[PDB]
Design a protein around this ligand. Structure first.
Ligand SMILES: [Cl-]
Length: 129
């Protein structure tokens, strides 16, 4: 499913991402826009052979199992396909583990290069939250 901007903001708020580990909602909406264009079904293969899945592009080397990433962990204990659902619960729950790992939202390259240090509240302006 392709979310609208405010529809995803509201879904993220309901699943407890707003100010999670100090990152306001706009940071999460900006990261999803630039990682997946708000498409839950987005995938992209990396040179190391791992793949990134779903609205927040969560990687199979560490976080999920896709059966084709040798030596990977599965720290979120889920098949990577669960991250492609129209229900973002599994992606949110795994993103809370990633953001708690030490580097905060710098784990998401698009957030660090396109959202960090910008006016991220713009991403939630206008929405009924
Ligand atoms: Cl980037």
């Amino acid at each position: 499913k392709v979310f609208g901007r405010c529809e995803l903001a509201a879904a993220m708020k309901r699943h407890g991402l707003d100010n999670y580990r100090g990152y306001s909602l706009g940071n999460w909406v900006c990261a999803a826009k630039f990682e997946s264009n708000f498409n839950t079904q987005a995938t992209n293969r990396n040179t190391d052979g791992s793949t990134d899945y779903g609205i927040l592009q969560i990687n199979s080397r560490w976080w999920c199992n896709d059966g084709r990433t040798p030596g990977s962990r599965n720290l979120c204990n889920i098949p990577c396909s669960a991250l492609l659902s129209s229900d973002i619960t599994a992606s949110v729950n795994c993103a809370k583990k990633i953001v708690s790992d030490g580097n905060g939202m710098n784990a998401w390259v698009a957030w660090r290069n396109r959202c960090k240090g910008t006016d991220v509240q713009a991403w939630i302006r206008g929405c009924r939250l």
